């Protein structure tokens, strides 16, 4: 029953000082941080180490996708860095995912959570047909999420719409990391067509990745506490 | 000039990697930095390789939504790398966005190369991820998608090279791993270049050699 902040703040800064100036405004007890391909390619593991020094848990969002040997060694490198969560493309296949899980076994209970990416949020039918996928996107997402589960991974990134059905098929403990949700207290957070954070969590999301609504706030600390209180 | 050999640097230790690079001349080869060394040692390692005079293929196979993939590719251009790759399975829009963001970096911009079907994927692996096409046919589809997006070439095997070169043209670059300088089942460097490969990615045959600079010199002389 330890502290488990549900909001993961996306850090997508092209400047290190701006990024750290933002982190200075928030508390590690109230959120987690996501470091993606942009900030990692620009600033590397030293940036992640600085976030760790500040006491934050980090989701290293690099979506590794390579042959099993290479993908597993990259995941091992994430474990050497001491990250809380790391992701891989399920499209890399079952053997790639299983090899990545296997290599983390020696890191014990503190090992990174290993999460699969199914179909990127930017992709719709047309984009999928372009890369040779003819099945309906929802069915393909379920295929890839099931592949991840069967490879022994800890969870997947998924939309709020997908969450309940994924828990039903894959288990109550399978971790669901959900992007695209806006604070109810923000502008366009009152819109009904997209789930609020409370609705997303009720639907099965375990974590909510949120970016600009927080990083652009005058008082991101206030926005986080409001999101948190509502969950 | 244009060294055709790209040496794979897959070390889990910085000192060991640098001791190896100390043995070779930057005029005789290029270097590949992948997900393992980049995750462990980051852009500072790539900058050290540039300081030593080497051109680098940053092999991180970016695969994300177009905005994010393009920002990662821009980060590669900011680092000054010679080549960077992305997964063609990220789709045409992701690849085109990555090319567009490189436009202002001029002629010195990183070459942008697509990854088609990973070497690890045979028919059974492909079925598992929702692909029912023969792997060779899927490679051709994804390589064509890469060219359509305006990219500079693809990573491809010795088996795939001549067919891709014939179909997609002389100027579309083919970067080929798995080659071994002289079993007869694996192509030699001269055989691969003749088959259409533009660059060769070579690992252990060079990194584990008693005299890596001699292996490189022998490979380079065999290509004419
Ligand atoms: Cl806070
Ligand atoms: Cl492998
Ligand atoms: Cl996008
Ligand atoms: Cl089948
Ligand atoms: Mg504070």
Curated annotation (Swiss-Prot), chain A:
SMART domains, A to Z: OMPdecase
The protein's Enzyme Commission number: 4.1.1.23
UniProt xrefs under Pfam families: OMPdecase
Any GO MF annotation of the entry: orotidine-5'-phosphate decarboxylase activity
GO CC term (a single one): cytosol
Pathway this chain belongs to: Pyrimidine metabolism; UMP biosynthesis via de novo pathway; UMP from orotate: step 2/2
InterPro entries: Aldolase_TIM (IPR013785), OMPdecase (IPR014732), OMPdecase_AS (IPR018089), OMPdecase_bac (IPR047596), OMPdeCOase_dom (IPR001754), RibuloseP-bd_barrel (IPR011060)
Leading EC class: lyase
Catalytic residues (UniProt): 63 (proton donor)
Gene Ontology BP terms: 'de novo' pyrimidine nucleobase biosynthetic process; 'de novo' UMP biosynthetic process
Transmembrane spans: none
Residues the entry annotates as binding substrate: 12, 34, 61-70, 121, 182, 191, 211-212
Record's keyword annotation contains Lyase: yes
Quaternary structure, from the entry: Homodimer.
UniProt name for this protein: Orotidine 5'-phosphate decarboxylase
Organism annotation: Vibrio cholerae serotype O1 (strain ATCC 39315 / El Tor Inaba N16961)
The organism's taxonomic lineage, starting at the top: Bacteria, Pseudomonadati, Pseudomonadota, Gammaproteobacteria, Vibrionales
Curated annotation (Swiss-Prot), chain B:
Function: Catalyzes the decarboxylation of orotidine 5'-monophosphate (OMP) to uridine 5'-monophosphate (UMP).
Alphabetically ordered keywords of this record: Decarboxylase, Lyase, Pyrimidine biosynthesis
Record note on quaternary structure: Homodimer.
Cellular component GO terms held in the UniProt record: cytosol
Protein name in UniProt: Orotidine 5'-phosphate decarboxylase
Pathway: Pyrimidine metabolism; UMP biosynthesis via de novo pathway; UMP from orotate: step 2/2
HAMAP family hit by this protein: OMPdecase_type1_B (MF_01200_B)
MF terms (GO), sorted A to Z: orotidine-5'-phosphate decarboxylase activity
Active site location: 61
Homology family: Belongs to the OMP decarboxylase family. Type 1 subfamily.
SMART domains the record matches: OMPdecase
Stretches assigned to coiled coil: none
E.C. number(s) listed in UniProt: 4.1.1.23
InterPro entries referenced in this protein's UniProt entry, alphabetically: Aldolase_TIM, OMPdecase, OMPdecase_AS, OMPdecase_bac, OMPdeCOase_dom, RibuloseP-bd_barrel
SUPFAM superfamilies listed in its UniProt record: Ribulose-phoshate binding barrel
List of residues binding substrate: 10, 32, 59-68, 119, 180, 183, 203-204
Reactions that this protein is recorded to catalyse: orotidine 5'-phosphate + H(+) = UMP + CO2
Disulfide bridge positions per record: none
A biological process term (GO) from this entry: 'de novo' UMP biosynthetic process
Signal sequence region: none
